[PDB]
Design a protein around this ligand. Structure first.
Ligand code: HEM
Ligand code: HEM
Lengths: 362, 363
């Protein structure tokens, strides 16, 4: 129920312990006025400071002038902060506006087409994103709703994704959650305590070539549909062979415990863990921070199910791209399809009460 | 606060404490073979007994024969029972199968068309429902996914809805949840503690005319979209006037406290509370047990959110129908739209370890 501090050198919501719920929204910008957009970023920052401390935005949810709409929509009244974090990112398309073209980071790379991609263009891309994570879904929806309202006339929601449960871990001392295939997901991640590993693999450094991004990170989002009918008829051995870990304990094949180190040569050559492991990818390491989703039925008699995969990294070209390229032969590909994609530059943290989202860029 | 008993005279999930999360699924039946369907109901009951105790279905999620698919899909391993309840219901369309046409309860009435209805046929109806409620949404989803799998070849999933209420880890049990319009929702309801009110208004009695339904109830489900962005532009006064209660405290107009009894004549004539109150409907009283939903954003960038309204009652004709008819002129209608609907007969409880869902109907 506690608050996660909002200010810092880095934005919260990355290294932070992974909260139970996600509401992710991508926005397109509809104003060509730079000053108007800067004013929005400041108003959003002010709102975020309220929201993440469990307070209502603006002058509150009630007790104002009867003839005015309340400043806050009110559905989070009486609720705790619930570890709400709000993380903003800027998409490549933003940099075509406001004279920003030459400030687009090299590390904000467009992704290549990957074999098997079936990307919905309507649920891909976006000028900007807001990741809202919290332990209470109502708290997360309230935050996104109120930001969108404040931004009316300057930004529109392009697409959104709710995540009902986490499929990631930045806290190895706590139980690793399972994805909808029934496997633990998050054992070998980067922990929030691993400052050296965060600095090496997650945070952008001044020397990487884009000074305004120092202390930021780069985000890849992939909406992945799971073929659960196909998976559910697979044998136990087939499932375990796909991953290279057993299902019950989630230990590497041959070993007894979840957190025993993988011995890659005992896994099938097309096992997911074997192909995704840093040692298979020249050391490339990601911070995975995704969530599960179900968006109803598929119209063919079955539940829809998927994973909204989020990865943070210091450079898209040295993080997600090499690892995904190496997944071209993954046994897991029989059971999944990527159907949405976006990339974002996640700026540095809001340093104090006078700072604002995007201040280093603008 | 860990598990809710599965067995009882009544199915759990109606009068038992309201859990934080919902996964509601409607199923259509694909078999014409009564014996095959009965067999399914027995297998589903066996699975439900395991699921509600926090155990995997069948022989488990791992450790069986390597060359066999696991009996349980495994995504709830490591989780707690989470107060899971599984409540089954039978839709009117089920009664056109298996020779059951003369056993359809008269209280399982088809709803009339109501003004402003915009029902999506794909997210309406269904031969069967399973209401899965739990504090952890993964526990609920796991239940529905595994029931659907056990039933594959005999049933299909027609439509599915996830919902949320409060989060109990951080929110006191007594506090009334707010809906997504920002108003407290549930103040004047039937509580599961009110045994006599449940007998009067919720449970079917034998003398009501359908003996197999004694101890059961009737469910109306309505997927109600809110026009969030239009609502959020309304003034505070307009919003309070729509309901007849203030937004901060949720007190009736002219009163000080949430739980103060309303004075209906102080409210506007078409205020929601005034139109919905039992006194305005000949005493008709409902058990509301709905959940909020937020599914995403639509193609216009608007929030696809609302209330997945669930009401339990002793007879649809004397519960939901009169009350919803009375909402024809509700000021709230400007801001909502009913976009899905279904009705179900919820049979009596599973009495003991040898009983099974639907045993009073199938025999
Ligand atoms: C639906 C899609 C996916 C599923 C179900 C899945 C599942 C898993 C599982 C069960 C593990 C083992 C436990 C762990 O260490 O986390 C794992 C590990 C991993 N996955 Fe995935 N994954 C998916 C997609 C991806 C994608 C798209 C990437 C990257 C492009 C990826 C990268 C990784 C990495 C880096 C590891 C850790 C390998 C190691 O260092 O041991 N996964 N995944
Ligand atoms: C999105 C749709 C709806 C919203 C936002 C809504 C909201 C509310 C709110 C805020 C209250 C007052 C507090 C309370 O006592 O719970 C209320 C009361 C009530 N509502 Fe609704 N409602 C909706 C739909 C319906 C429908 C479809 C029905 C029935 C057909 C209904 C029946 C009732 C009843 C019976 C009461 C209690 C009245 C009393 O006895 O004081 N509501 N609703």
């Amino acid at each position: 129920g506690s608050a996660v501090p909002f200010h810092g050198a880095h934005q919260a919501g990355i290294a932070t312990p992974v909260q139970d719920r996600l509401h992710f929204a991508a926005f397109d910008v509809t104003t060509e006025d730079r000053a108007a957009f800067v004013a929005l970023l400041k108003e959003w920052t002010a709102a975020a400071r309220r929201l993440t401390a469990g307070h209502a935005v603006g002058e509150g949810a009630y007790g104002g002038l009867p003839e005015a709409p309340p400043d806050d929509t009110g559905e989070a009244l009486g609720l705790k902060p619930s570890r709400l974090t709000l993380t903003i990112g800027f998409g490549p398309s933003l940099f075509t506006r406001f004279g920003l073209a030459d400030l687009r980071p090299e590390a904000l790379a467009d992704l290549p087409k990957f074999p098997g991609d079936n990307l919905d263009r309507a649920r891909s891309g976006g000028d900007l994103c807001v990741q809202a994570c919290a332990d209470d879904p109502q708290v997360a929806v309230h935050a996104i709703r109120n930001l969108a309202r404040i931004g009316f006339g300057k930004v529109v929601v392009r697409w959104s994704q709710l995540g009902f449960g986490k499929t990631s871990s930045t806290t190895p001392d706590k139980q690793t959650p399972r994805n909808l295939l029934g496997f633990k997901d998050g054992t070998r991640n980067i922990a929030g305590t691993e400052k050296d590993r965060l600095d090496r693999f997650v945070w952008a450094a001044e020397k990487d070539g884009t000074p305004w991004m120092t202390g930021g990170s780069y985000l890849v989002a992939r909406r992945i549909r799971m073929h659960i009918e196909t998976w559910d008829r697979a044998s136990l051995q087939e499932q375990e062979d796909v991953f290279g870990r057993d299902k019950g304990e989630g230990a590497p094949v041959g070993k007894a415990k979840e957190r025993d180190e993988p011995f890659l040569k005992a896994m099938k050559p097309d096992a997911h863990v074997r192909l995704a492991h840093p040692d298979s990818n020249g050391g490339a390491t990601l911070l995975r921070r995704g969530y599960s989703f179900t968006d109803g039925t598929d119209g063919l008699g079955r539940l829809d199910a998927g994973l909204f995969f989020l990865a943070y990294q210091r450079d898209i070209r040295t993080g997600f791209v090499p690892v995904q390229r190496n997944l071209a032969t993954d046994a897991l590909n029989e059971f999944i399809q990527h159907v949405g994609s976006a990339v974002f530059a996640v700026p540095p943290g809001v340093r104090d009460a006078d700072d604002w989202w995007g201040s280093t860029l603008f």
